[PDB]
Design an enzyme around this catalytic site. Structure first.
Site, short mmCIF file in Angstrom:
data_model
loop_
_atom_site.label_atom_id
_atom_site.label_comp_id
_atom_site.label_asym_id
_atom_site.label_seq_id
_atom_site.Cartn_x
_atom_site.Cartn_y
_atom_site.Cartn_z
N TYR A 134 0.76 -0.98 -0.16
CA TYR A 134 0.05 -0.23 0.27
C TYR A 134 1.05 1.36 0.12
CZ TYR A 134 -3.51 3.63 0.97
OH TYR A 134 -4.07 5.26 1.60
N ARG A 181 1.30 8.16 13.18
CA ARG A 181 0.73 9.06 13.88
C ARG A 181 -0.62 9.77 14.32
NH1 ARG A 181 0.71 13.14 10.02
NH2 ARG A 181 3.02 13.72 9.88
N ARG A 191 -11.86 5.42 8.24
CA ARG A 191 -9.68 5.16 7.28
C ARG A 191 -9.17 4.44 8.39
NH1 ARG A 191 -10.47 10.79 5.82
NH2 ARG A 191 -8.75 10.59 7.39
N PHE A 251 15.28 19.43 -0.80
CA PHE A 251 13.82 19.32 -0.20
C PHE A 251 13.54 17.22 -0.44
CE2 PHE A 251 10.67 17.08 -3.45
CZ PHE A 251 9.61 18.20 -3.62
C1 LIG Z 1 1.92 10.92 0.82
C2 LIG Z 1 3.36 11.62 0.44
C3 LIG Z 1 4.63 11.13 2.10
C4 LIG Z 1 4.04 10.86 -0.63
C5 LIG Z 1 3.02 13.08 0.95
N1 LIG Z 1 4.73 14.33 0.59
C6 LIG Z 1 5.45 14.83 2.27
O1 LIG Z 1 4.54 14.36 3.29
C7 LIG Z 1 5.63 16.04 2.08
C8 LIG Z 1 5.64 16.56 2.75
C9 LIG Z 1 4.98 17.55 3.43
O2 LIG Z 1 4.24 18.19 2.03
N2 LIG Z 1 5.23 17.76 4.26
C10 LIG Z 1 3.87 18.27 5.31
C11 LIG Z 1 2.57 17.06 5.79
C12 LIG Z 1 1.66 18.78 6.35
O3 LIG Z 1 0.97 19.35 5.41
O4 LIG Z 1 1.74 18.41 7.79
C13 LIG Z 1 4.18 20.03 5.64
O5 LIG Z 1 3.75 20.86 6.25
O6 LIG Z 1 5.00 19.53 6.90
O7 LIG Z 1 7.21 15.44 1.08
C14 LIG Z 1 7.33 14.12 0.36
C15 LIG Z 1 7.98 13.47 -0.53
C16 LIG Z 1 9.75 14.44 -0.93
C17 LIG Z 1 10.37 13.99 -0.93
C18 LIG Z 1 10.88 12.76 -1.52
C19 LIG Z 1 9.79 11.55 -1.26
C20 LIG Z 1 10.17 10.82 -1.42
C21 LIG Z 1 9.25 10.09 -1.16
C22 LIG Z 1 7.88 9.83 -0.81
C23 LIG Z 1 7.64 11.90 -0.58
C24 LIG Z 1 8.64 12.99 -0.55
C25 LIG Z 1 6.30 14.98 -1.20
C26 LIG Z 1 6.14 15.46 -2.21
C27 LIG Z 1 5.20 15.61 -2.47
CL1 LIG Z 1 5.80 15.96 -4.54
C28 LIG Z 1 3.69 15.22 -2.40
C29 LIG Z 1 3.76 15.36 -1.63
C30 LIG Z 1 4.41 14.48 -0.67
#
Ligand SMILES: CC(C)(C)CN1C(=O)[C@@H](CC(=O)N[C@@H](CC(=O)O)C(=O)O)O[C@H](c2cccc3ccccc23)c2cc(Cl)ccc21
Length: 323
Positions: A134, A181, A191, A251
């Site tokens: 998943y 978390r 969910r 990043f």
């Molecule tokens: C589900 C998820 C973990 C993939 C979400 N995800 C992330 O968690 C974000 C972080 C984020 O936005 N945190 C927020 C959460 C909040 O609002 O509280 C923050 O402000 O701290 O980073 C990821 C992310 C960044 C860099 C490399 C990655 C490699 C594998 C998977 C995800 C990767 C992310 C990159 C992209 Cl392009 C799109 C989504 C994400």
């Protein structure tokens, strides 16, 4: 004016990470901005429990094609990030403006992610292996996608996009920490994502962890899931150590550091079941030190009577004496 709208949504859907995305070099900026917004739309759909599985399946499955449907939008989402769906044509417009080498990557992840979201929508995550499955679908593929985008822009070596195993682990680490978390929030949202094969050994129904009387068993399972999560650290350190572009490093490193901080805060923490738990990453050596310090925080807290005590200690010793 569409790109501007896209950046406004990004900041709307991101509390702090938008600043980091906007700081990406060249083409990665718009490419990653769009990627994030598109992944947000799909995520909003999956999470919308006001939508029946009957409606969601075709939506999750056809999302990738929606990128190429100029007028497609979704107006029935009662989620927090509705606007991303409601004004999707704006985002798809900018997605079609991206270099085709980027589009190819993003579309593929969305299609595969869609199949994946549908697959787990009406079934229990059973084994830990299925949990990885998943997580791979919703976060691993995101790591794979990003890695491929990095290489396609050439800011990062072709190797980065090639090691899907490493990119996947990055995603699994973040996804699992979030699922751990967000247990209560998900319960309240209708969910469930915790592995049945793990929780059925502690309690009768996953929701039972939300019941006060079952706090001890809740914490033990929590501890076991976290120990499971720690196993991705080596790959995360490996993935991060290969990055050459500074904006890319920041990043990727930021979320991974915030993740381990979260695990460290959640570890053996009863508050995880009562609510949301409150809790330098610019160079590899510093990042490693940050990670190592957090691993020790967890280690010290290891209850010798915890079913996973030995396991948690062993993965920590591994991280300690490895890379
Ligand atoms: C589900 C998820 C973990 C993939 C979400 N995800 C992330 O968690 C974000 C972080 C984020 O936005 N945190 C927020 C959460 C909040 O609002 O509280 C923050 O402000 O701290 O980073 C990821 C992310 C960044 C860099 C490399 C990655 C490699 C594998 C998977 C995800 C990767 C992310 C990159 C992209 Cl392009 C799109 C989504 C994400």
């Amino acid at each position: 004016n569409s790109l501007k709208t896209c950046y406004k949504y990004l900041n709307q859907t991101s509390r702090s990470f938008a600043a980091v995305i906007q700081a990406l070099d060249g083409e990665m900026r718009n490419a990653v901005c769009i990627f994030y917004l598109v992944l947000r739309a799909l995520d909003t759909l999956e999470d919308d429990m006001t939508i029946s599985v009957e409606k969601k399946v075709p939506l999750l499955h056809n999302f990738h094609s929606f990128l190429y449907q100029p007028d497609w939008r979704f107006m029935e989402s009662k989620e927090k990030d509705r606007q991303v769906l409601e004004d999707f044509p704006t985002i798809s417009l900018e997605f079609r403006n991206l270099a085709e080498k980027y589009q190819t990557v993003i579309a593929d992840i969305c299609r595969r992610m869609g199949i994946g979201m549908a697959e787990f929508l009406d079934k229990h995550v059973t084994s830990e292996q299925e949990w990885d499955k998943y997580c791979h679908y919703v976060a691993g593929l995101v790591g794979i996608g990003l890695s491929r985008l990095f290489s396609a822009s050439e800011f990062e070596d072709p190797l980065v996009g090639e090691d899907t195993e490493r990119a996947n682990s990055m995603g699994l680490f973040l996804q699992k920490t979030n699922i751990i978390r967000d247990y209560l929030e998900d319960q309240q949202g209708g969910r469930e994502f915790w592995p049945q094969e793990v929780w059925s050994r502690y309690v009768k129904k996953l929701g039972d962890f939300a019941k006060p009387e079952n706090i001890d068993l809740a914490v033990q399972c929590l501890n076991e899931l976290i120990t499971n999560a720690l196993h991705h650290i080596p790959d995360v350190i490996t993935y991060l150590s290969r990055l050459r572009n500074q904006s890319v490093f920041n990043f990727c490193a930021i979320p991974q550091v915030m993740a381990i901080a979260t695990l460290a805060a959640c570890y053996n923490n009863q508050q995880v079941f009562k609510g949301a738990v409150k809790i330098d990453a610019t160079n590899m050596p510093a990042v490693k030190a940050i990670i190592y310090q957090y691993m020790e925080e967890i280690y010290h807290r290891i209850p010798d009577s915890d079913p996973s005590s030995s396991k948690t200690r062993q993965i920590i010793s591994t991280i300690r004496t490895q890379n």
